[PDB]
Amino acid sequence: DVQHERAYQKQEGASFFNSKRYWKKVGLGFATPKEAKEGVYVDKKCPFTGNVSIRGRILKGMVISNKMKRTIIIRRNYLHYVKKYNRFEKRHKNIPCHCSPCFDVKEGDIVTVGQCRPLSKTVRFNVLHVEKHQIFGSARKQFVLF
Amino acid sequence: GKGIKKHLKRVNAPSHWMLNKMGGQYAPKTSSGPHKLLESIPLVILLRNRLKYALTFDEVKMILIQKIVKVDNKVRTDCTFPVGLMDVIHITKSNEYFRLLYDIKGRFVPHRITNEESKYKLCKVKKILLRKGRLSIAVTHDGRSIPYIHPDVKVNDTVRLDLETGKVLEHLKFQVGSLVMVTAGHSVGRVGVISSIDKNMGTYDIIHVKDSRNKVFATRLSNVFVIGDNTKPYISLPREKGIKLDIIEERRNRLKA
Amino acid sequence: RDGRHKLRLTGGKKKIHKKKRKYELGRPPSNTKLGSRQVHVVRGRGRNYKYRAIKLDSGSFSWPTFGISKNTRIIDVVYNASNNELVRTKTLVKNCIVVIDSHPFTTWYENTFGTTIGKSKNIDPLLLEQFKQGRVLACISSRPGQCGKADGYIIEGDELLFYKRKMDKRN
RNA sequence: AAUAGAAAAAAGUAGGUAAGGGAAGUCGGCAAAAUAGAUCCGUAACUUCGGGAAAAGGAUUGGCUCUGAGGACAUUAAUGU
RNA sequence: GGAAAAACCGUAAAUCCUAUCUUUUAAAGGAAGGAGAAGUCGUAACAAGGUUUCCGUAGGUGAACCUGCGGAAGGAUCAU
RNA sequence: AUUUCAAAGAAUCAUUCUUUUUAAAAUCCGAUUUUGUUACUUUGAGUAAAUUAGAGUGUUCAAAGCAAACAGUUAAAGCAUUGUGUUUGAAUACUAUAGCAUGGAAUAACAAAAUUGAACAAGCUAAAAUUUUUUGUUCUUAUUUUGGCUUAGUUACGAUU
RNA sequence: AACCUGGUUGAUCUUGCCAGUAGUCAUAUGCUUGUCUCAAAGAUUAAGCCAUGCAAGUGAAAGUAUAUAUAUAUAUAUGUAGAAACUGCGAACGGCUCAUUAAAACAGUUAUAGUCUACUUGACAUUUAUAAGGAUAACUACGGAAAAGCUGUAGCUAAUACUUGCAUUAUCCUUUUGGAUAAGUAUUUGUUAGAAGGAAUUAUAACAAAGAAGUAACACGUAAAGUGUGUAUCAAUCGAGUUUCUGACCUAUCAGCUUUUGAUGUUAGGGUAUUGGCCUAACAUGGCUAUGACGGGUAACGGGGAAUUAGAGUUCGAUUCCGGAGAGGGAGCCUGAGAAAUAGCUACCACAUCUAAGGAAGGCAGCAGGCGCGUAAAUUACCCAAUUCUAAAGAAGAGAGG
């Protein structure tokens, strides 16, 4: 089933020869997903079963792209205050974020991400909660105010 | 190269050193030691700029060579040694004992203390570590390591500590009825009773503190020093007893003498 | 070396200033092969000593299922997860598959339980079939290039099946 | 094959090859030489936008010993030929 | 145990060749714009300026321009 | 555009400021206390000094400085148990808009939102808890109770102009 | 002090600019200058080039003295000084410039459950000895080379330099006690068991393997039993690296950029002090872009801040503090806790000094001072008293600094 990349995939720290799989509690008031926990998958950067852990900031964003292996790009839209005119303007910033196999994420879904140790050159958050939500037009042109 | 910085400009030094603009260019930089740089004083400042037993750094050196200063029951020898948040300075020639305390404006005054109370100090524990063989040890803001601490004492509880043996006499719980002293926040140098505790996940924790004039202010948990239990402060507070007059009243008081 | 002087996230060519700092390091890579034990001391930043094994042969190998270890000469390198070059060249690296001389384990089992702690977990037949022919498939776990010795574990069950299939449709 | 042998010089003719220079020779670079196969890169003025273009200009290429990639069948995913 | 010496990857200075870009800067001749005088030739514009003006456009001319075609009134008429 | 309007009391000069109660559900012993997100806004927290605004202070004055003041032709006075000068000052504020905590009624957004979606009462069912326990160092089994699921009923059942 | 006048015309009212006015911690310059306090000053031009001199050392109980000098008591005992030298610690801070550099560096704001950390602080350690092994400097002798902070031999001799290496405590049972048994700190592997933090593959506890390194063969004389020096682990501390979030000047006559030469990701490694395309291999085919990417410009180090402001603002910030960057241009390295160090080193290029020509030595944007450049800028001063730093720490040094 799961593995076929050219090294054995193991879920390290599971243990096999004594006991009585493995997953962790994540905290910060979040809930470990049932689909993560009783899922069968193997990972290393998943926040529910890797060695990685969440610490730092917690932000909400909108998913734009789903098309890498287990990795997503989120846009944070926000309003910038311009002191000259006492007024605002839209500006935005992309955060590349690791996913998990647990969620099933579609372009325009809202996601709650957390900060964690660096997992790739620009992958520096990982997804904690998938807030499902249909969208019209294209997400790249869309504006959510969170 | 790009090593550690050993110099300290006099202007760049903490405001609560209370040094002037025109007095040379470099301050004493505190040596590394049992209290943080920003949260102490170097012994030179205490001797010369506060007590006034020296007019020069040189006179401080002359005083220091003589083993007539003792901090924490032991002789000290470096000029730049830190005074520490709570400690006992003993000047043996004139038989004087000082305990170091904050005023109500935010700086350290050396406060005249009796011989009997001089033999103990108050130590906040910052951490508690479990070391080999299942033996706990507590770690103090006084830079000092405490072996074989009670399991009944936890991280924000303070502890009364002898200076002869270095062992614990008793402890003061951080319970919401205990006297607390503010150590470094905006409202540094006050005493209150602990009104209320607010615990915030992943982030700073704030405690609401009430003054004896019933004024309330909040402060960050990091800098809060338990100082007694509801009967009394466990060490003798300085003149204004940790109570801060408001500016208008303070100026009105100053004039009305 | 480390951490800069490669392209911007946008795809841009970011400018360079700040001449390479010593604390970057990027120390020269070490192969390590199968031969007679020979190790070099390396002085790392802050006086952290590390051990560069350049040749090895004798490791600490653990039978995970019984939690016990014996020291054994390692017969050959047979498969590597990553590039085929390392296995071809007979060079060790962390996650590599070697074969160990099984006589210590065989001897231990016979002494302890009898027949060729948490007793009687009953081997596996595929593993047992390998065991008779006296040289057994194992995965190195420690990092030779860091630790100066190569330490590993006997492969088991599902992991064993995976490595056997990949190692030897079949050419 | 409208001849043969022997000798071996000038000259002729069909050829080679030349230090150092590199068109100074000559009406004239004529002659001769340099180049060239392939793969991988890189490719301007200008243009009727189709081209110019193999532009220009580079790099590589043996022998051996290996590694990876690419199919067809037939057994009840795996297993085989 | 070990100095000299070498070979291989890897850092990689530097030198030269192209290629593009950048910057001033030369150049016969061409063709503009301004500045200067009392120079020549006209009479184009302002009045119905002595062919109403002006636009867009195209051709012509010594130059100012003239003419065609279609517009405008900032026209000389707000009107049988 | 639209979804919670108001009513009563005391202070004060004739207005002003302040308190009480008035739907519904959950929760706690017929009474007691919780209830969208975000912007926004309020307080706060945590903020280097110099600079700067700024309080104190007759540098000869000021620019300044961060000090000083007081009594005494040499002692009184205080307080220490025959000794020791005494009062002291170096405040306060600011330190992006972003980040952190925090009260909030309005104003804005947004979420939730019928070719249909509920809320509860009834019954069956598979998961957990509770009680029991077969047998010469340890393998079972059995009733009961609680959350999830399949199936008729019952409600001011459900949609702003 | 929330301010306006002169100029289109024959005269007029507008629009509109130009001219005036004031300031400018903003430079230059012209004339004049009696006082006193206060005090910026080779940044704009050349991160151009540099003569000479100076700018980092260090021993007051406490590693090493048969160079040598010396005071007491009886060749001897103690001592006291001590040139010289090994060793130790510092010299990786300071100070200077602002060329580079426009999501870079920087400011606030996180994180370090991803790490390193000398001096200093407090806890506090485990598998022959009435005292161990050399070999080396200064030093002695012979020397060489025009010259250099050049150094050759041979004979010596010490060390807290270098190098060996000596027990004894704890666990379970009768029951104060009498017996039996255990006994490696980091680190690393495999196996499991599980006081705290928001969350643990965490502290920790056990089992089976490996395993550094140590735990005084050192020096004083302290309290009417002490100190220095070295030392494993932990914590503290002075800090450092990465690292989250958010914030910038001008330009579209720069619109598609980036991916063979890692661009974006996945896996596995290697490497790091540690995370990571940080680097190798294999595999994906992405990532960024008019909400301005990718380029170009900047006479652009950033910020604290400065000038001008009624209120908005606009310009300025080489320059006292903080942070960054760099030491002629690039590059590479050693040592050590800390360096890709520049009064450490190696090379190249660009410059350039001494040389008897064989070779040698070099880097002022330290302070002075010179040349050049220029619109544009001071003494080859005196002093370590204060301010501080460094040292084997009073007492010595410091063109840091005054």
Q: Catalogue the E-assigned strands of A48-86.
A: 54-68, 71-82
CB contact at 8 A, B163 and B119 = yes
Angstrom distance (rounded) from CA C15 to CA C7: 9
Q: What is the length of chain A?
A: 146
> How many C-beta neighbours within 10 Å does residue C64 have?
15
Residue type, A8: Y
Q: How does B145-163 read in b/e, with b if 16+ C-beta sit within 10 Å?
A: ebeebeeebeebbbbbbeb
What is the identity of the amino acid at A63?
A: V
Burial bucket for residue C68 (CB in 10 Å: 0-12, 13-18, 19+)? middle
B55, two tokens:
């007019």
Query: What span, in angstroms and rounded, lies between the C-alpha atoms of A108 and A65?
Result: 9
Q: Do B201 and A55 touch (CB under 8 A)?
A: no
Residue nearest to nucleotide G238 (CA to C1'): B32
The number of beta carbons lying within 10 Å of the beta carbon of residue A68 is 13
Q: After which residues is chain C broken (C to N over 2.5 A)?
A: 116, 168
User: CB–CB of C121 and A3 under 8 A?
Assistant: no
The Cβ of residue A51 has, within 10 Å, a number of other Cβ atoms equal to 11
Q: How far apart are CA A104 and CA A63, in angstroms?
A: 12
Q: Is C61 helix (H, G, I), strand (E, B) or coil?
A: strand
Q: What is the dihedral of CA C65, C71, C75, C81, to 10 degrees?
A: 50
User: Taking CA atoms, what residue in B is nearest to A30?
Assistant: B201
The method of structure determination was cryo-EM
Residues A104 and A111: their CA atoms lie apart, in Å, by 11
d(CA B24, CA B151) in angstroms, rounded, equals 51
Q: Which residue out of A5, A17, A20, A122 would a mutagenesis test of the C interface target, given it has the greatest number of C Cβ atoms within 10 Å?
A: A17
CA distances from C97 to B193, C104, C128, C153, C160 (A): 66, 19, 18, 10, 11
Please give the full DSSP string across B22-52, using - where no structure is assigned: SS-SBPPPPPS-SS-GGGS-BHHIIIIIIS-
CA angle B222, B226, B230 (to 5 degrees): 140
Show which residues on chain B lie within 8 Å of chain A, measured between beta carbons.
Answer: 201-202
Other chains touching C, judged by 3 or more CB pairs under 8 Å: A
> Any chain C CB within 8 A of the CB of A7?
yes
A65 sits in the region (left: phi over 0; alpha: psi -120 to 50; else beta) called beta
